[PDB]
Amino acid sequence: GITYKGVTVHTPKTWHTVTGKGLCAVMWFWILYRAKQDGPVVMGWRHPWDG
Amino acid sequence: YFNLSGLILCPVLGSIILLFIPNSRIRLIRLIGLCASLITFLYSLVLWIQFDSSTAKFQFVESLRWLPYENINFYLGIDGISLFFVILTTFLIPICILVGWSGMRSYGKEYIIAFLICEFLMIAVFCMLDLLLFYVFFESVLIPMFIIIGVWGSRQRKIKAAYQFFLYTLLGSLFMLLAILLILFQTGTTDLQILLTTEFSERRQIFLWIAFFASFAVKVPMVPVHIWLPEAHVEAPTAGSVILAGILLKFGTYGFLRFSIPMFPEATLCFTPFIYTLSAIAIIYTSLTTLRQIDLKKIIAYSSVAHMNLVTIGMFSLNIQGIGGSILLMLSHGLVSSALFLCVGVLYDRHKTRLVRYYGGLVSTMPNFSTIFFFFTLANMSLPGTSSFIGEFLILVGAFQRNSLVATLAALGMILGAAYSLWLYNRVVSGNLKPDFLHKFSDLNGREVFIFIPFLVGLVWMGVYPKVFLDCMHTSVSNLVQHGKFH
Amino acid sequence: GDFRAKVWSMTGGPNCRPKHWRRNTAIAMFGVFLVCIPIAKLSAKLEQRPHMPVRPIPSQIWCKNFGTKDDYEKEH
Amino acid sequence: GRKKGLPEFEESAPDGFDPENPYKDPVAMVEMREHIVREKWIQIEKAKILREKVKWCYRVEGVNHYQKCRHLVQQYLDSTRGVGWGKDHRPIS
Amino acid sequence: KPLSVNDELMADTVGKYEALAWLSGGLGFFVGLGLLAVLNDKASKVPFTPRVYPYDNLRVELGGEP
Amino acid sequence: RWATPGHEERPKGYFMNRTPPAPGQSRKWEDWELPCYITSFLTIVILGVGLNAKPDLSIETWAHQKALERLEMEK
Amino acid sequence: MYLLIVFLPLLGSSVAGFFGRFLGSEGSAIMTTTCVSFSSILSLIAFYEVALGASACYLRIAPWISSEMFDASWGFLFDSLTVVMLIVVTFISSLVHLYSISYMSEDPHSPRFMCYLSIFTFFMLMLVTGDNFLQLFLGWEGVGLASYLLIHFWFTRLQADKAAIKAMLVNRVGDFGLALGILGCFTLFQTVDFSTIFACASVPRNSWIFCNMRLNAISLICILLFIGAVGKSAQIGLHTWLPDAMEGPTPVSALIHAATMVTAGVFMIARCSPLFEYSPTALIVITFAGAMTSFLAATTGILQNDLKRVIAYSTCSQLGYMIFACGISNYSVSVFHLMNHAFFKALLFLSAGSVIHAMSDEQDMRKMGGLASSFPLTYAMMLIGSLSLIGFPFLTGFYSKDVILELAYTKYTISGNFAFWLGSVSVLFTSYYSFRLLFLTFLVPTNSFGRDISRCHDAPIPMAIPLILLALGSLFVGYLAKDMMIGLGTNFWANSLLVLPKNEILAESEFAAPTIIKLIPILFSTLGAFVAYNVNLVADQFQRAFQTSTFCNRLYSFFNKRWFFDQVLNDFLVRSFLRFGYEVSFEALDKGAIEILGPYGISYTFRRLAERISQ
Amino acid sequence: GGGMETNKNKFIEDWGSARENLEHNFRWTRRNFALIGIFGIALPIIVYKGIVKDFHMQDEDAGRPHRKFL
Ligand SMILES: CCCCCCCCCCCCCCCCCC(=O)O[C@@H](COC(=O)CCCCCCCCCCCCCCC)COP(=O)(O)OCC[N+](C)(C)C
Ligand SMILES: CCCCCCCCCCCCCCCCCCCC(=O)O[C@H](COC(=O)CCCCCCCCCCCCCC)COP(=O)(O)OCCN
């Protein structure tokens, strides 16, 4: 709770911020990890083993 | 040994006992009338148990001489078609007696006596196998219903409605009686089993069929003659409307099933497009006129014309799905429609009004009524799991096999049927309250809760397992499908 | 309001909170459990599995109609 | 007092009935009508049994149901042409 | 204040006919796009021959005569 | 919220809108309740014990065992 | 164990609605949540056993309707297709039940809401586990009844009742179409069971006489069934009910309209695939309708300002995508996208409801902004949902939408090109309005009021567990189920889905097309995101064009007011029928015309005739 | 106010009575004549022709001659 001009904004609890940051970080890491594995495949640079 | 004699004599004893009882003993009159009705209902239920479902021959046949040469005589018998009609017409009477339980002090003994004479006359209608005596008990119902409409009407309009109903019934009745007389003179007798084995010249089939249609179409209002039903129905007591819609509307269809669809197989085929045309527009017109009605009892009364005209599509399809599925609709309609008029009767007894404008927000003051009213709203709009859907769908599959166009037009009936059925419920039950108009409320009492219970049980029991009713009719409705056919 | 406390409804009304809803809740579970037993026993009897499972499945503990309809030529 | 068990019906065409003039002997007419209804119901139940056979052939076989249930499907569709009081295809019984 | 006879059924910047014209134009967009798709004739520009299956296009396995 | 005991000791509104009887007494039945309840009991007894015990006489059963017999005699 | 899957929600509803006065607002929630959760775990064992164990179960209880041959018994059919719908419907229902425990914490009539949710879940389970066409119809109309009941759960409102009645009318037209289709099915095969119909669906090659027209028997039935599918799935013909149906509670939007009951049409098309495969004419209609619906919803949803209404058009677009994915005769991809969408759209609705509930029920995006710092969890969750929805690479929405688009490209036919074009433009539009919703609600400078910000509280535990589970689903489930459902030659579906050898283009969808086609959705999504950012976050706000150009104002009104459907359709059909009810049928046919020639209009001349007898 | 009976309004009651006493409200104008001669005389004929032609086309498809529906 911080008041600038009358209005106050209740600071969120630690549990919410930690969970949101963790889920976002998991999403980003998963996207990059998938881009490492089959990123060239969707780009068309290399087939899995077709050719 | 339970036969048709005792079932018919029970209302006779019930009406005679109350005939010679002092009117000051109001309690005894009600108890004896209710006991007689319940005993008759149990007698009918027992008659169901011992009903053979493998023979097309009429069962529990009884004979009583009428003319000295046995030309015409009292032949009583039931089959798979008229058994459930007898059960329904014996089951509806105790409910009608229980409706006027609180206010019975003003009606007197002439109320229960009239209803018991009604039950006596309607039981014999569904049991008669003689063409002439079927007409005698066919038009004997007018006097008790005339008395019920006139003596215990709501407003001064009761004189007009009774006159109109009586005149229409008479004009149908005598034009049918001329045909019955012509059949008697030519054939020689009036026994149904003999009239079903006599070849009629093709020229005489059309005239006799038209004459029979004149009387039956009035009691199953097709298109030109559904103007007596709304007025006579609205100007009727709460129990009076149950009889008019529950049973009195089932004479026309039963008359078609018993004396028209078989005695003239060739005439029925020729007039099949005519019946399809009248029934298709009746479903479209009536289900549409229902939207612009403002009276609570004049909306449900218009929900019966669409449903009953959907039945005549099923009967004239002439197949097991059609004819067999049309019977379930009338049993379902006899329970769903008669339960809706109980719901309206509940609202009218407390608040002496019927306009939908005065009603609204009852969901917050009468919750048990709202739950019960909603359930019968679902049944009236052909929901699966209800007895109406089984009959409604079986008729559609019975008419699609004969004509795809008539099954398409009749399918819009459930489109419009689901429109006003829920839209009425939204107005009456849902919404905000109007304390300016009406402010005192009372939910369903012990009688109303108990009265609706057999309707609730008998509507889902037929809706989830209709095999109990269906298997008792297939032997009797299959012999009805083909009579002149031999291949 | 003041009058909605005088209206009986099956659902319970607005902001319904009985003094002994904990005990009633425990009873309702036990009633649901008792009525679910015959349904489970009925289901294990009328169920048919034409195909043997790839791996041992838990339904083989109670169900016994496994690989029974393989002779479909003699079905009724 | 009916005997315990299933109903018993004589399975034979009632003698005396002639299709030339059906409205000649009334009792033979109703007996013939009942008999014809009985064999139409027999045909209906035979078609239902064939339908059950097709139903359990489709489920047991699976993907291969096109070649294994061909023999049953054509029998069932041949037996559903003359079912009875159905489409305009009416059996000449 | 007597009630109206039709007192049972009771986008303000547009009229019924003008909005119907707008709807007709919107649906004519779809119709014109469909006509353009027809004019493209993608069927004649397929880059591969129709797939051919063994055993006479799987006639027996598809319910054909044995 | 999930631990505090409720405030409504008894459900709001009387069932069927009938005041509870005098303490140490019972709800006196109306003149119609007993005949209607014995009728409703006898109906259930007759239907449950009668429909389930009547023989399976039907045209979908005799015809079934006649078709099942003629379907194998053709072979 | 399989009857328990279907009947636990029914028992929970029957307890919480009949004896809710003894359980209160907490016991009624516990009963329904526990029953649906046990049904969900039982569906998990059902998935481990039927879909993975490859042993379907067929269970018949008792005959329902027994005519001469109109047999529609009480049968349940659990195959690979049914089990996927089970693990979707029941899991989403359990999560919505858990969500509503905290959402309906101050509403008075919470027990009835949970009873309605349980009965809806029961009806949906009867729909998906249907062996016949009538049990399927039973569920198909019970689901409509439950949606109608839940839409006006606040009966005091007038807009809720209007939306509910409109939804019932549209679903009733759909039910009429479905009933005609079912009647057609029985006239051909003399059965309504799925096994017999699908076994005998290839032999009939005859023609019928339908409404003075000679049509093909199978094609007519397929078109009639697709009419019902359009009615329930809110397709091009009948879709106006879905945007208006948002007047109900947010959990109603998340379950009743996002995950389930809009995928009912897609499920019915996929299940009836062994019948739709033999009517090539119907597939063209399905493809055209799906493409039109997707593009129209995408165009309509870009100018809405209501938070809940924007998501409804996203659901409509996704359903259109599934529909014309079924139209290319690739039902595996359709069900895959259905299951994918049932995760990241339920998540979107739940997060939007969490924002709305904390914002004192403020639903306008013009009056929210700068909520990212205040609502960290919900902002992250809506970010995940939006990224999945737009089809961000290597995410749940990427493994299905991209496959659908590339499949539409390789369907070298007239119908396929139209669907490909509309589905390509709809990707750009979807990206635009999804990113506009994300930007306006969370990242723009604050436009709300002081009171809304002062009273702020993020989602508590009961409203956060379903969110987190849906986030994990929308992160990983698409990748996990990519191989089993849309793999090459997979036998996961077994006999659930039939694709004829002639119309099989799954192999060419992967390696027969330039790599540019496989990157069109990503490029269009990036373009839409850039356009949304440049029009919302930083712009001169040239809206003065909307105040000086007459065409721009009318163009803005066209997209905002649902392409002028509600206004035009009302005036030209509903008002016309209301006039047709009174001004003719009641006013002239039966008012006095029968009376004047009847017994008292002119027949009362007997008074002017009997009195003359004195002569 | 110890009565459950509604406090009926003059405007609503009169409006309902007028809506129920419409039997005596015809003037036999061209609108009523055209309306009853079209939507009560032509639509039934169109429908009857529809069913009759449907039966005829069903008959011709099977090769059987048309049935005399008169
Ligand atoms: C028939 C086949 C389909 C069955 C569908 C069933 C769907 C439910 C149908 C009934 C729902 C109730 C709608 C009508 C009543 C409207 C709401 C109402 O007033 O009901 C009461 C009574 O509560 C109920 O709604 C009970 C009815 C539903 C519970 C029983 C359903 C049991 C399961 C459904 C049937 C099982 C089989 C279904 C499958 C065939 C609730 O009142 P409150 O929520 O407390 O708020 C009102 C305000 N005040 C208290 C001041 C009056
Ligand atoms: C407190 C209530 C609160 C509201 C409750 C709402 C409704 C809840 C109850 C739902 C209704 C339950 C009824 C049962 C439906 C499913 C079972 C169908 C009946 C059934 O299968 O058994 C058949 C009849 O037996 C029987 O069991 C018959 C007994 C049924 C008694 C029903 C009494 C209804 C009274 C209606 C009177 C009017 C009747 C209509 C004219 C025999 O089966 P089968 O033929 O195959 O025989 C095979 C012999 N081998």
Side-chain angles (χ1 to χ4, degrees), chain B residues 87 453 457 460-461 465 468, chain F residues 44 47-48 51-52:
Chain B
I87 294 181
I453 283 291
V457 184
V460 294
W461 175 38
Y465 201 52
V468 177
Chain F
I44 301 299
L47 287 184
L51 291 194
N52 287 291

Side-chain angles (χ1 to χ4, degrees), chain B residues 333-363:
Chain B
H333 178 253
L335 264 69
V336 174
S337 78
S338 70
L340 277 171
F341 299 130
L342 296 180
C343 283
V344 161
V346 163
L347 274 193
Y348 183 84
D349 291 331
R350 300 146 157 72
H351 324 91
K352 299 282 152 165
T353 197
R354 290 189 301 271
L355 282 168
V356 193
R357 174 82 72 213
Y358 290 98
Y359 290 109
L362 304 179
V363 70

Side-chain angles (χ1 to χ4, degrees), chain B residues 285 292 358 402-403 437, chain H residues 7 9 19 39 55 58 69:
Chain B
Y285 281 177
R292 317 291 280 111
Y358 290 98
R402 285 273 290 238
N403 188 291
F437 295 142
Chain H
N7 264 326
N9 189 359
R19 274 276 316 267
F39 292 165
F55 288 165
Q58 280 174 39
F69 279 114

